[PDB]
Design a protein around this ligand. Sequence first.
Ligand SMILES: Cc1cc2nc3c(=O)[nH]c(=O)nc-3n(C[C@H](O)[C@H](O)[C@H](O)COP(=O)(O)O)c2cc1C
Ligand SMILES: Cc1cc2nc3c(=O)[nH]c(=O)nc-3n(C[C@H](O)[C@H](O)[C@H](O)COP(=O)(O)O)c2cc1C
Lengths: 338, 339
Amino acid sequence: MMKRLVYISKIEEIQRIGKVSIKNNQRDNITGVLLYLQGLFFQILEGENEKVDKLYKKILVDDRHTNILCLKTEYDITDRMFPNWAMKTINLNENSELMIQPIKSLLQTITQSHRVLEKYMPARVIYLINQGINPLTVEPQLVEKIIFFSDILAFSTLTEKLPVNEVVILVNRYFSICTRIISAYGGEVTKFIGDCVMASFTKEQGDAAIRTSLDIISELKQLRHHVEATNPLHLLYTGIGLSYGHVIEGNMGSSLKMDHTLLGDAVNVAARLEALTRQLPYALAFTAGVKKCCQAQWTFINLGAHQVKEAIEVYTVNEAQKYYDTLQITQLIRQTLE
Amino acid sequence: MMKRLVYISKISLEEIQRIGKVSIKNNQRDNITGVLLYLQGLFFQILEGENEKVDKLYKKILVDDRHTNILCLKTEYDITDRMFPNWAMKTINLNENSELMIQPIKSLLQTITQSHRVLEKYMPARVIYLINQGINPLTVEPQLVEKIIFFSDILAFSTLTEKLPVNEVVILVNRYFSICTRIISAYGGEVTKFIGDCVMASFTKEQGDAAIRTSLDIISELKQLRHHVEATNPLHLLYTGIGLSYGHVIEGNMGSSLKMDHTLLGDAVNVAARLEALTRQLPYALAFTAGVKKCCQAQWTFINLGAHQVEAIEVYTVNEAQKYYDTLQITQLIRQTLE
Ligand SMILES: Cc1cc2nc3c(=O)[nH]c(=O)nc-3n(C[C@H](O)[C@H](O)[C@H](O)COP(=O)(O)O)c2cc1C
Ligand SMILES: Cc1cc2nc3c(=O)[nH]c(=O)nc-3n(C[C@H](O)[C@H](O)[C@H](O)COP(=O)(O)O)c2cc1C
């Protein structure tokens, strides 16, 4: 019982790789091809499922290539695609045969475009593709999730005073910090909504959601004093709202336009809790449901009941206390660029 | 000096070899050369020649019956040498080539291509437009542009998600997105993203009339949809409210290397979303700002809804958007239906 997987990755040393591959693939009864064109890697692997997943696990951690996307996984294949090739390496760059020049140039234009599109896809969708699962045909399921929401404090004022490029530098720097921190703790960013970041966590990731929130506030606090006063990054603040509940996670839309979205009351609650941090001396606020997903011991602070558009309990942690004032900031932002 | 463009498309031998006959004859009288390759129901074509000769030719290929979902991937300008000087139009049937050496390239081309096709469906319409124009969307700078922000969402959606089984909520939301995306695109709008049950789109400042007709068409097609199905279908309960605004917004792609997204930043984006919720409290399913009103040339029968705290802004609508129903009785009827 064998399987076949195909992946692309971003890059004489290659000849050393192919010879080591022929050595190990024979020993592991693995067949397949490695093709490379214009600094790109294309490899097809096939063999028994145990020995293949053992091999692919090594190649994912290889130094020489990165941006490794597994496009297709075949299970229970009937016949080997290349039964005689332990690991045939094909340098498409050196191939000057004029009957393959179109297909070779088409394999580049489509692959270059395919990587550009990958950077816009939702994180969950890319995960589904790496697992050999067709994202269009995955039944949306009801799952218990922690909803994350973070946006820039007083962003309306910042668009008024700053020129366009400084606003874009700022918004990009904010998204970059959020995504890297969220992804590092295991959270899945769903989409950017204006200046708002939306992510989710599994119900066992209550501590990671709180720690992600604290780490984002920390990385922004460092950035503000790490740069000069004229740098617009000196004005970057955030508030974060978390919520727990059941949501429908899946792919909605038409064949024309499709997206990955979460449907549920908790989505709006986390968004409304986030906007509440403008009126609290805490850059973080979450429901009691998030509080009950946390195994670790936090010094939880009760902020009372608040009416969210009946009133729910709102909490925070002692680490997330603001040293500044929300009004002091909107003034010091307006007056800095005044 | 010539231009060269590449595109993929989807199929709708003797019927196809005929395309080679007609095209070879014209490509020489047009001083055009290129290759046409097809594999597992997909079309690939490269072209080159004087710009005027290619622009007029690609316009004919764009409206051809025998293929659909055409996407131009690459476009190079100011080239010296033709990549294929010998062939006015050489067809290649990769489904009928099995030289051993070509098998890896062939299997890789269909896989990468299918995957590419899937990714397009998730791409924002604006990113696809930049790809069609041959412009790398990753290197484009965001700019301040004047837009009409479109906002619409499903009425009483919190009630439906509670009463309906999960698989039935999906059908309703898919159908709603399907109707909105179809109408918004047909009027020259760009769906920018779905936000839960919410649809956000944008129209240029010359499309004020297209923005209103888009909103009335969506209300019309849902009203038609409601009485087209049975009363036990979830679609019998699908209503909508729409809000529009006009203002300067920063349109452009943003994000890190990990995640990129095309988004709109501006005061008007929030102003539009507040109007879509204001329709709950109005006898009209549509509500737009006075800025949208000045983008319309058609003699609309505008209705003034006064100023509204959001400092206050003027709210307008058209008589065609009048709700033939009470909004509050609808939220009651939806509950007492699935109850
Ligand atoms: C593009 C690429 C293709 C590779 N192909 C193979 C392969 O076909 N077979 C294989 O065993 N390893 C392959 N590798 C990875 C190396 O085998 C692996 O990183 C290393 O040789 C581990 O060897 P070791 O067992 O001595 O520790 C590939 C790596 C890259 C970057
Ligand atoms: C996939 C495809 C590729 C085509 N490529 C060319 C082409 O390269 N040159 C050309 O003259 N016609 C090409 N055609 C034909 C045009 O679609 C058009 O129908 C044809 O030029 C009709 O010629 P007419 O203007 O005399 O009616 C192509 C058609 C298809 C379906």
